[PDB]
Design a protein around this motif. Structure first.
Motif, PDB file in Angstrom:
ATOM      1  N   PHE A 128     -60.310 -13.642  76.564  1.00 10.80           N
ATOM      2  CA  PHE A 128     -61.231 -12.559  76.247  1.00 10.80           C
ATOM      3  C   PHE A 128     -62.090 -12.014  77.380  1.00 10.80           C
ATOM      4  CE2 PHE A 128     -65.378 -11.042  74.739  1.00 10.80           C
ATOM      5  CZ  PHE A 128     -64.982  -9.938  74.012  1.00 10.80           C
ATOM      6  N   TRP A 157     -87.482 -23.230  69.144  1.00  9.26           N
ATOM      7  CA  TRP A 157     -88.249 -22.140  68.573  1.00  9.26           C
ATOM      8  C   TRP A 157     -88.464 -22.372  67.087  1.00  9.26           C
ATOM      9  CZ3 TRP A 157     -88.778 -16.600  70.366  1.00  9.26           C
ATOM     10  CH2 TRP A 157     -89.427 -15.829  69.399  1.00  9.26           C
ATOM     11  N   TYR A 180     -93.998 -17.237  67.734  1.00  7.71           N
ATOM     12  CA  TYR A 180     -93.946 -15.876  68.250  1.00  7.71           C
ATOM     13  C   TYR A 180     -95.087 -15.535  69.200  1.00  7.71           C
ATOM     14  CZ  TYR A 180     -93.692 -10.804  68.416  1.00  7.71           C
ATOM     15  OH  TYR A 180     -93.624  -9.500  68.840  1.00  7.71           O
ATOM     16  N   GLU A 181     -96.219 -16.209  69.042  1.00  8.51           N
ATOM     17  CA  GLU A 181     -97.369 -15.947  69.895  1.00  8.51           C
ATOM     18  C   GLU A 181     -97.662 -17.122  70.813  1.00  8.51           C
ATOM     19  OE1 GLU A 181     -98.794 -15.728  65.425  1.00  8.51           O
ATOM     20  OE2 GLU A 181    -100.350 -15.993  66.951  1.00  8.51           O
ATOM     21  N   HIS A 194     -95.820 -17.799  73.621  1.00  9.26           N
ATOM     22  CA  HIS A 194     -95.554 -17.445  75.010  1.00  9.26           C
ATOM     23  C   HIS A 194     -96.765 -16.800  75.668  1.00  9.26           C
ATOM     24  CE1 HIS A 194     -94.527 -14.656  78.225  1.00  9.26           C
ATOM     25  NE2 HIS A 194     -93.471 -15.400  78.498  1.00  9.26           N
ATOM     26  N   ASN A 195     -97.382 -15.852  74.973  1.00 10.35           N
ATOM     27  CA  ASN A 195     -98.544 -15.150  75.505  1.00 10.35           C
ATOM     28  C   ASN A 195     -99.797 -16.015  75.473  1.00 10.35           C
ATOM     29  OD1 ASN A 195     -96.675 -12.940  75.371  1.00 10.35           O
ATOM     30  ND2 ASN A 195     -98.423 -11.540  75.319  1.00 10.35           N
ATOM     31  N   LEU A 205     -76.157 -16.168  70.611  1.00 15.00           N
ATOM     32  CA  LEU A 205     -76.337 -15.063  69.686  1.00 15.00           C
ATOM     33  C   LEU A 205     -77.370 -15.379  68.626  1.00 15.00           C
ATOM     34  CD1 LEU A 205     -72.674 -14.012  69.558  1.00 15.00           C
ATOM     35  CD2 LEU A 205     -74.569 -12.888  70.672  1.00 15.00           C
ATOM     36  N   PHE A 241     -80.185 -17.093  69.223  1.00 15.49           N
ATOM     37  CA  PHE A 241     -81.488 -16.840  69.813  1.00 15.49           C
ATOM     38  C   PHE A 241     -81.731 -15.352  69.992  1.00 15.49           C
ATOM     39  CE2 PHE A 241     -84.386 -16.186  73.296  1.00 15.49           C
ATOM     40  CZ  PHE A 241     -85.449 -16.898  72.839  1.00 15.49           C
ATOM     41  N   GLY A 242     -80.684 -14.594  70.308  1.00 17.27           N
ATOM     42  CA  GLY A 242     -80.835 -13.157  70.419  1.00 17.27           C
ATOM     43  C   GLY A 242     -81.155 -12.506  69.097  1.00 17.27           C
ATOM     44  N   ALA A 266     -85.043 -13.658  68.239  1.00 21.72           N
ATOM     45  CA  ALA A 266     -86.034 -13.010  69.093  1.00 21.72           C
ATOM     46  C   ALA A 266     -86.136 -11.510  68.845  1.00 21.72           C
ATOM     47  CB  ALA A 266     -85.706 -13.268  70.561  1.00 21.72           C
ATOM     48  N   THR A 267     -85.067 -10.899  68.351  1.00 16.47           N
ATOM     49  CA  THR A 267     -85.064  -9.459  68.116  1.00 16.47           C
ATOM     50  C   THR A 267     -85.751  -9.050  66.820  1.00 16.47           C
ATOM     51  OG1 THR A 267     -82.978  -9.316  69.341  1.00 16.47           O
ATOM     52  CG2 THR A 267     -83.667  -7.377  68.101  1.00 16.47           C
ATOM     53  N   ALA A 287     -89.472  -9.116  66.274  1.00 18.49           N
ATOM     54  CA  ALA A 287     -90.287  -8.261  67.112  1.00 18.49           C
ATOM     55  C   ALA A 287     -90.262  -6.807  66.681  1.00 18.49           C
ATOM     56  CB  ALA A 287     -89.834  -8.373  68.566  1.00 18.49           C
TER      57      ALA A 287
HETATM   58  C1  LIG Z   1     -95.468 -12.313  71.572  1.00 20.66           C
HETATM   59  C2  LIG Z   1     -95.352 -13.403  72.594  1.00 20.66           C
HETATM   60  O1  LIG Z   1     -96.329 -13.892  73.135  1.00 20.66           O
HETATM   61  O2  LIG Z   1     -94.043 -13.916  72.961  1.00 20.66           O
HETATM   62  C3  LIG Z   1     -93.080 -12.895  73.210  1.00 20.66           C
HETATM   63  C4  LIG Z   1     -92.536 -13.085  74.616  1.00 20.66           C
HETATM   64  C5  LIG Z   1     -91.508 -12.021  74.976  1.00 20.66           C
HETATM   65  C6  LIG Z   1     -90.753 -12.453  76.224  1.00 20.66           C
HETATM   66  C7  LIG Z   1     -92.210 -10.695  75.234  1.00 20.66           C
HETATM   67  C8  LIG Z   1     -90.505 -11.826  73.864  1.00 20.66           C
HETATM   68  C9  LIG Z   1     -89.333 -11.486  74.163  1.00 20.66           C
HETATM   69  C10 LIG Z   1     -88.184 -11.104  74.499  1.00 20.66           C
HETATM   70  C11 LIG Z   1     -86.949 -11.778  74.056  1.00 20.66           C
HETATM   71  C12 LIG Z   1     -87.008 -13.126  73.401  1.00 20.66           C
HETATM   72  C13 LIG Z   1     -85.776 -11.158  74.259  1.00 20.66           C
HETATM   73  C14 LIG Z   1     -84.492 -11.726  73.861  1.00 20.66           C
HETATM   74  C15 LIG Z   1     -83.432 -10.920  73.872  1.00 20.66           C
HETATM   75  C16 LIG Z   1     -82.081 -11.368  73.485  1.00 20.66           C
HETATM   76  C17 LIG Z   1     -81.751 -12.829  73.424  1.00 20.66           C
HETATM   77  C18 LIG Z   1     -81.154 -10.449  73.189  1.00 20.66           C
HETATM   78  C19 LIG Z   1     -79.798 -10.822  72.797  1.00 20.66           C
HETATM   79  C20 LIG Z   1     -78.915  -9.868  72.507  1.00 20.66           C
HETATM   80  C21 LIG Z   1     -77.552 -10.209  72.110  1.00 20.66           C
HETATM   81  C22 LIG Z   1     -76.660  -9.242  71.851  1.00 20.66           C
HETATM   82  C23 LIG Z   1     -77.058  -7.802  71.969  1.00 20.66           C
HETATM   83  C24 LIG Z   1     -75.283  -9.588  71.449  1.00 20.66           C
HETATM   84  C25 LIG Z   1     -74.466  -8.631  71.020  1.00 20.66           C
HETATM   85  C26 LIG Z   1     -73.095  -8.928  70.612  1.00 20.66           C
HETATM   86  C27 LIG Z   1     -72.189  -7.941  70.648  1.00 20.66           C
HETATM   87  C28 LIG Z   1     -72.607  -6.577  71.105  1.00 20.66           C
HETATM   88  C29 LIG Z   1     -70.801  -8.150  70.253  1.00 20.66           C
HETATM   89  O3  LIG Z   1     -70.042  -7.199  70.266  1.00 20.66           O
HETATM   90  C30 LIG Z   1     -70.303  -9.511  69.833  1.00 20.66           C
HETATM   91  C31 LIG Z   1     -68.803  -9.454  69.544  1.00 20.66           C
HETATM   92  O4  LIG Z   1     -68.042  -8.760  70.523  1.00 20.66           O
HETATM   93  C32 LIG Z   1     -67.939 -10.181  70.563  1.00 20.66           C
HETATM   94  C33 LIG Z   1     -68.306 -10.662  71.960  1.00 20.66           C
HETATM   95  C34 LIG Z   1     -66.526 -10.548  70.122  1.00 20.66           C
HETATM   96  C35 LIG Z   1     -66.420 -11.122  68.712  1.00 20.66           C
HETATM   97  O5  LIG Z   1     -66.185 -12.531  68.779  1.00 20.66           O
HETATM   98  C36 LIG Z   1     -67.661 -10.842  67.877  1.00 20.66           C
HETATM   99  C37 LIG Z   1     -68.195  -9.446  68.151  1.00 20.66           C
HETATM  100  C38 LIG Z   1     -67.050  -8.444  68.093  1.00 20.66           C
HETATM  101  C39 LIG Z   1     -69.247  -9.078  67.113  1.00 20.66           C
HETATM  102  C40 LIG Z   1     -90.885 -11.993  72.413  1.00 20.66           C
HETATM  103  C41 LIG Z   1     -89.639 -12.320  71.603  1.00 20.66           C
HETATM  104  O6  LIG Z   1     -91.441 -10.762  71.942  1.00 20.66           O
HETATM  105  C42 LIG Z   1     -91.923 -13.090  72.244  1.00 20.66           C
END
Ligand SMILES: CC(=O)O[C@H]1CC(C)(C)C(=C=C/C(C)=C/C=C/C(C)=C/C=C/C=C(C)/C=C/C=C(\C)C(=O)C[C@@]23O[C@]2(C)C[C@@H](O)CC3(C)C)[C@](C)(O)C1
Ligand code: CLA
Ligand code: CLA
Ligand code: CLA
Ligand code: CLA
Ligand code: CLA
Ligand SMILES: CCCCCCCCCCCCCCCCCC(=O)OC[C@H](CO[C@@H]1O[C@H](CO)[C@H](O)[C@H](O)[C@H]1O)OC(=O)CCCCCCCCCCCCCCCCC
Ligand SMILES: CCCCCCCCCCCCCCCC(=O)OC[C@H](COP(=O)(O)OC[C@@H](O)CO)OC(=O)CCCCCCCCCCCCCCC
Ligand code: KC1
Ligand SMILES: CC1=C(C#C/C(C)=C/C=C/C(C)=C/C=C/C=C(C)/C=C/C=C(C)/C=C/[C@@]23O[C@]2(C)C[C@@H](O)CC3(C)C)C(C)(C)C[C@H](O)C1
Ligand SMILES: CCCCCCCCCCCCO[C@@H]1O[C@H](CO)[C@@H](O[C@H]2O[C@H](CO)[C@@H](O)[C@H](O)[C@H]2O)[C@H](O)[C@H]1O
Ligand SMILES: CCCCCCCCCCCCO[C@@H]1O[C@H](CO)[C@@H](O[C@H]2O[C@H](CO)[C@@H](O)[C@H](O)[C@H]2O)[C@H](O)[C@H]1O
Lengths: 74, 188, 214, 173
Positions: C39, C89, C116-117, C119-120, C193, C195-196, C199-200, C203
């Motif tokens: 893949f 988490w 969720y709060e 980290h900050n 996936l 954790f993604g 976390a999404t 928020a």
């Molecule tokens: C408030 C506070 O103080 O803390 C805050 C701190 C801070 C840092 C600001 C924060 C933050 C930011 C965070 C945590 C950000 C994390 C972001 C993250 C982790 C994002 C993952 C994305 C994954 C994706 C898009 C996968 C897609 C998958 C896709 C597009 C596929 O096509 C999958 C697939 O095609 C495969 C490969 C093949 C097949 O087998 C299956 C199929 C076809 C479906 C928080 C959360 O706000 C908390």
């Protein structure tokens, strides 16, 4: 700016490969040879340096009457 | 072939196994440098000096906190690390800059010896020949243990000395005060 | 367009990938690595750049890592962090029954109601800043190996450290090791996936901060 | 061989339905062996350490300077943990911390075939006894711990969820 040149560690620029890359179709060979010149002759060095330092002292005099840097001097 | 401490990678080439405390821990290859006036001889002379200063500094903090200052000093205070240092300087700064000039004479001469000791390989790293007690006219296996115990205590003291400085300037309390405070908060 | 295209040195027009049978297989993929179904629809394994240049620059000396090798090493580290981060988490949120929190008032429910709060809140305190330094030491002591393998001076597998303190695999047949390795990858993929997801949702404008985040 | 060893008794024999002894190497099984040996000894002391003082056994005198043994007249035995002061709760861990070292710093570790965790402070020599009679005792030691690992979990679940245990919920704790 004092990290732009290569000395003992791989990273950095060699002055020779810079100059030798600059050649246009009006300039022919361009800057080839200016290294031997500027690393085997002290006269060619002063010719640049005195022209620069002299231009600098002119530049310095224009900026000290318009923006006076010392207190109670203006 | 493999580092004893990092068993997933090759052991660095110059870490022979001869110095005390050598378990092959140098992942970035710092023993390999031979430029800008420094190398494995200078790095080992650096490390042993860092060891020694930090071993004295830990006892020097614990001395004037558990038992207070020497007779002839007064107005004892909260932490003994910074708070007493600026205090004494303001009180009588003569003995403290006596020492800074005396250290300065010792350092300028020990720095000549390090550069002279590498050109002719007859000065061991760290060795100033200070053995008035004669530990070293004894067993060579017993003296090799004393060499490793100096390094092992000196490496641990570097974390402790840099520890007690920084959390002294952060909490503005004593080092045994900080340990009892941390005992209270994580009472568990 | 009259040079020899770059699509040919990295696309192998003879076989086809197991995943996506209409695309041909990338040249560096095999059946050799664990968790492999061929893949790579974007042909990333096929990029002829040295990604060890990020650690050490290419101008230091002659050297080259295989692109596939650096990817596996990344994907394992992305797997490991996400398996712990998703688990850590939820555990501090009380998703497994007990609200697991460090002893002490500062990490209690009253100062931090949910993860969720955290980290900050911990970033201002400093406990966050401390963990940045502690990871920093490990990363630096473990990322120098990538250089060795890129100089051809090592025969270590990607993501392989002699970390088996309970001796799971000492004396296991390569069939047994490969299957176990696939578990690190398949569970790691699901947790990247997971954790993604967590976390999404947590928020957006709605979305709670309970164990279920929908 | 899982059947021929301390801990394989009559009513079950080799008890491993999900095949966990095969899951690693011989060094793996030796780790689980002395885990259950240590899980037993903590649970045997906690099950017994619970019954007694739930009945009012009551050390005479003072535990510490002002927090003397009133911890038994009223609070449950799951409590009187935070009532023990910090310096009292500290020595306990550090005697344990020290006891975990001789356990680990033996001439041959146990997962390399060495001896299992022996008594740290009073080391009466134990080498001499008939090894036939020795095998019967290590079955007795583990089975009482097996029963105590279940029992200390019963005692926690009764203190959290009332009515979670039938002939045990009518007990003041
Ligand atoms: C408030 C506070 O103080 O803390 C805050 C701190 C801070 C840092 C600001 C924060 C933050 C930011 C965070 C945590 C950000 C994390 C972001 C993250 C982790 C994002 C993952 C994305 C994954 C994706 C898009 C996968 C897609 C998958 C896709 C597009 C596929 O096509 C999958 C697939 O095609 C495969 C490969 C093949 C097949 O087998 C299956 C199929 C076809 C479906 C928080 C959360 O706000 C908390
Ligand atoms: C080696 C350890 C040591 C020892 C044995 C002493 C002992 C002494 N110091 Mg002294 N001192 C020490 C370290 C030591 N100090 C250090 C490290 C410093 C530098 C901060 C000083 C700075 C100091 C001063 C400034 C003075 C003394 C004085 C004295 C004497 C007064 C005793 C007294 O009245 O007791 C009660 C006593 C002989 C006093 C004195 O009269 O000396 C004769 C005095 O004025 N000391
Ligand atoms: C990706 C992993 C990850 C990360 C980044 C965090 C981060 C955090 N956790 Mg957390 N946690 C995790 C996994 C993780 N957790 C897991 C898996 C568990 C359950 C076993 C927990 C259980 C847990 C509890 C119970 C609590 C937190 C809390 C916290 C916060 C403060 C902790 C702190 O400052 O460090 C302090 C901790 C340390 C400095 C420990 C040392 C960490 C070492 C240096 C990491 C390196 C070793 C690592 C395992 C990798 C090994 C090497 C590798 C090559 C294999 C912070 C948000 C606290 C909080 O605020 O809750 C809301 C809290 O009370 N966590
Ligand atoms: C899981 C183990 C454990 C833990 C955490 C505690 C913790 C505690 N016990 Mg406790 N206790 C235990 C086991 C344990 N005990 C056992 C096994 C017994 C004997 C049957 C006792 C008997 C006991 C009494 C009588 C009292 C406490 C009390 C207390 C509290 C005050 C601290 C103290 O003096 O402890 C002392 C703990 C001990 C003396 C036992 C540990 C000793 C080690 C393990 C060596 C074993 C000694 C011996 C060889 C084994 C005898 C067991 C059996 C053969 C009789 C504290 C909360 C007192 C309290 O405050 O009441 C609420 C109190 O009155 N305990
Ligand atoms: C043989 C060495 C030794 C010595 C000198 C002491 C001395 C002391 N212990 Mg003790 N203790 C020891 C061994 C020793 N312990 C061991 C081996 C254990 C078992 C691990 C304990 C468990 C223990 C507990 C549980 C407590 C003490 C406490 C105390 C202190 C009472 C002070 C007080 O009332 O508050 C002034 C006293 C300094 C008490 C304490 O400091 O808190 C008040 C306390 O709660 N001890
Ligand atoms: C005089 C005080 C004293 C002290 C300081 C110790 C200290 C210790 N004993 Mg111990 N023990 C003692 C008396 C004492 N014992 C007596 C009189 C007996 C009866 C013969 C035992 C029987 C005994 C056994 C059977 C075991 C220990 C164990 C231990 C270690 C950890 C458990 C613990 O905290 O026990 C604290 C002890 C007390 C508070 C005494 C009450 C520790 C080093 C354990 C060990 O070695 O771990 C592997 C263990 O299994 N002890
Ligand atoms: C004032 C100047 C401040 C000091 C700056 C350091 C320059 C000194 C150069 C000699 C050191 C050297 O050559 O390294 C040498 C080592 C390499 O180590 C060896 O080098 C030898 C030749 O020098 C050989 O090539 C060997 O093969 C190689 O293993 O380089 C490194 O490992 C550095 C890693 C890069 C890490 C950067 C991340 C952040 C670092 C910033 C640190 C902040 C301030 C530094 C404290
Ligand atoms: C000003 C014009 C200008 O900047 O042109 C720039 C033009 C650029 O020439 P080349 O592209 O050949 O230069 C390439 C290298 O010499 C650059 O280092 O230089 C000349 O042709 C010199 C003509 C003299 C101009 C007569 C006055
Ligand atoms: C959507 C993603 C897509 C990307 C991202 C992409 C990128 C590149 N294409 Mg490409 N491409 C298509 C898709 C994509 N191409 C399609 C649908 C067609 C048919 C219309 C097509 C046709 C050609 C031809 C005819 C050539 C070509 C090349 C390169 C080249 C390297 C440049 C270099 O580094 O020198 C790069 C980066 C050339 C080559 O290999 O030699 C110079 C070359 O002749 N392409
Ligand atoms: C010429 C020569 C040589 C040489 C040389 C050279 C350049 C020698 C120079 C050496 C040099 C320049 C040595 C500096 C030391 C500084 C120290 C120890 C500072 C300590 C400072 C400490 C411990 C703390 C300071 C504080 O500030 C802190 C952190 C908080 C502030 O609130 C206030 C205080 C005071 C508490 C060689 C190399 C040998 C080669 C040749 O052979 C001969
Ligand atoms: C970052 C800056 C690094 C600071 C380290 C500089 C200290 C070394 C100074 C040069 O050390 C030099 O060593 C050579 C032999 O190697 C000696 O040669 C004689 C010189 O007498 C000595 O001066
Ligand atoms: C709480 C969440 C609910 C999820 C519960 C899921 C149940 C877990 C599955 C049970 C399987 C674990 O049981 C374990 O399986 C592995 C791999 O199959 C076996 O693995 C071991 O034996 C097998 C033979 O089957 C060998 O091929 C292998 O080389 C060896 O490592 C172990 O012998 C067995 O102890």
């Amino acid at each position: 700016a004092g990290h732009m040149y290569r000395t003992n560690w791989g990273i950095g620029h060699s002055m020779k490969e810079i100059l030798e890359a600059h050649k246009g179709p009006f300039t022919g060979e361009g800057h080839k040879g200016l290294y031997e010149i500027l690393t085997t002759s002290w006269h060619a060095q002063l010719a640049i340096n005195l022209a620069m330092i002299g231009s600098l002292s002119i530049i310095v005099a224009h900026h000290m009457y318009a923006m006076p840097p010392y207190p109670y001097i203006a | 072939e493999k580092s004893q401490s990092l068993p997933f990678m090759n052991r660095p080439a110059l870490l022979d196994g001869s110095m005390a405390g050598d378990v092959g821990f140098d992942p970035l290859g710092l023993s390999n440098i031979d430029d800008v006036g420094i190398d494995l001889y200078w790095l080992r002379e650096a490390e042993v000096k860092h060891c020694r200063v930090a071993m004295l500094a830990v006892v020097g903090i614990l001395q004037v906190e558990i038992f207070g200052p020497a007779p002839g000093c007064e107005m004892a205070t909260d932490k003994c690390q910074m708070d007493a240092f600026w205090q004494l300087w303001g009180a009588h700064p003569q003995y403290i800059a006596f020492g800074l000039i005396m250290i300065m004479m010792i350092e300028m001469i020990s720095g000549i010896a390090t550069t002279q000791g590498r050109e002719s390989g007859e000065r061991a790293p760290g060795d100033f020949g200070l053995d008035p007690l004669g530990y070293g006219k004894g067993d060579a296996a017993g003296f090799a243990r004393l060499q490793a115990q100096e390094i092992a205590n000196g490496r641990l003291a570097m974390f402790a000395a840099a520890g007690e400085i920084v959390q002294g300037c952060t909490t503005h309390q004593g080092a045994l005060e900080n340990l009892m405070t941390a005992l209270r908060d994580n009472s568990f | 367009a009259m040079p020899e295209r770059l699509w040919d040195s990295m696309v192998d027009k003879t076989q086809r990938s197991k995943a996506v049978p209409f695309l041909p297989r990338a040249v560096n993929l095999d059946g050799s690595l664990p968790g492999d179904v061929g893949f790579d629809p974007f042909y990333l394994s096929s990029i002829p750049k040295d990604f060890s240049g990020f650690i050490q620059p290419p101008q230091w000396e002659e050297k080259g890592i295989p692109t596939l090798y650096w990817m596996r090493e990344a994907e394992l580290k992305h797997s490991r962090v996400a398996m712990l981060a998703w688990f850590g988490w939820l555990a501090t949120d009380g998703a497994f029954g007990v609200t697991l929190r460090f002893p002490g008032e500062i990490y209690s429910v009253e100062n931090i109601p949910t993860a969720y709060e955290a980290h900050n809140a911990l970033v201002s305190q400093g406990s966050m800043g401390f963990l940045l330094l502690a990871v920093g030491f490990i990363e630096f002591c473990t990322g120098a190996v990538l250089v060795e393998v890129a100089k051809g001076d090592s025969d270590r597998e990607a993501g392989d450290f002699k970390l088996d303190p309970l001796s799971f695999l000492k004396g296991k047949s390569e069939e047994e090791i490969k299957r176990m390795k696939t578990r690190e990858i398949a569970n790691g993929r699901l947790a990247m996936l997971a954790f993604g997801g967590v976390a999404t949702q947590t928020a957006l404008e709605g979305g709670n901060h309970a164990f279920p985040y929908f | 061989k899982v059947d021929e060893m301390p801990g394989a008794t009559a009513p079950l024999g080799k008890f491993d339905p999900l095949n966990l002894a095969t899951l690693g190497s011989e060094s793996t099984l030796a780790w689980f062996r002395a885990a259950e040996l240590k899980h037993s000894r903590v649970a045997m002391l906690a099950t017994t350490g619970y019954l007694v003082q739930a009945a009012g056994i009551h050390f005479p005198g003072m535990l510490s300077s002002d927090v003397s043994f009133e911890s038994l007249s009223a609070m449950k035995p799951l409590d009187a943990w935070d009532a023990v002061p910090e310096g009292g709760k500290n020595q306990i861990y550090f005697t344990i911390f020290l006891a975990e070292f001789i356990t680990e710093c033996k001439g041959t570790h146990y997962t390399k075939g060495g001896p299992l965790p022996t008594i740290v402070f009073p080391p009466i020599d134990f080498s001499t006894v008939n090894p036939e009679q020795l095998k019967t005792r290590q079955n007795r030691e583990l089975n009482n711990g097996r029963l105590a690992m279940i029992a200390i979990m019963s005692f926690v679940a009764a203190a959290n969820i009332p009515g979670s245990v039938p002939a045990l919920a009518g007990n003041p704790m």
